[PDB]
Design a protein around this ligand. Sequence first.
Ligand code: NA
Length: 308
Amino acid sequence: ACATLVAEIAERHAGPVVLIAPDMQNALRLHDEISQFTDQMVMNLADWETLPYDSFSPHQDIISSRLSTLYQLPTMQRGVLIVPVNTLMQRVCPHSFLHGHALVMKKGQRLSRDALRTQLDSAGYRHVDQVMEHGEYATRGALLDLFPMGSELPYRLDFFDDEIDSLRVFDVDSQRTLEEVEAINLLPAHEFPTDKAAIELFRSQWRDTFEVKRDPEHIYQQVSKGTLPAGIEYWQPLFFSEPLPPLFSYFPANTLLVNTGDLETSAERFQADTLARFENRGVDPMRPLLPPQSLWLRVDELFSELKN
Ligand code: NA
């Protein structure tokens, strides 16, 4: 009953409609249901699927989907955004990050293959033998394949005379290119910068926050050496000089929010869980944790945003 109604509300509303779902399963379900009932854009902001302060980093395919949504959100004048309540409570990278750290590659651009590799490494992409998943790139001869975050398919670039001669969508299974494109937009491989300037910032803010140990297993030591610990996402705030804003900061004018379910209890349950985890595991020699408010809106703050 939620689906058709949200489609109708969105159809007559001079702005995006944000459907706050009770959980991820419902959210995911509501995507195709609402999509089939409208000609307007329908997106989901996918949950990381990790537990708060998890010892796992979310799958790159989930990150690709989130980056695509966050990138499109500010200019989504019409349509629907579906977001689980616990996900909506999570703070995000500021939108200045995406439009500021995105790189554009165009046909005819003077740039060597190795120079592009350098940019890709600093943007968080992984060098592999064969591209197959979001966030990977492979190089061989004059060719460089990459799977841009937010893209449905990877691309194959041909460098001739140290110039990008062509950029072509490419089908992994058949190892063949499809259409040629004039340019591609390269977003970062994470919702946080990981270049050397970002690592220096991370180190500096970490020192102002936590103790440092030299054990190679310590988070600070791992990031300083250019690696990204499993679950590093829960220290996302340290990669930015300003606090992480609410997702609400990405909503365009006239955004209407619709609630489906018992958001209060769900919201309080999640807050209680993140708080228990922080209290029980926050003081740790190798992975000390940031307080919940560095990463999540408080339940009272959520409802305030819902009434503003
Ligand atoms: Na319709």
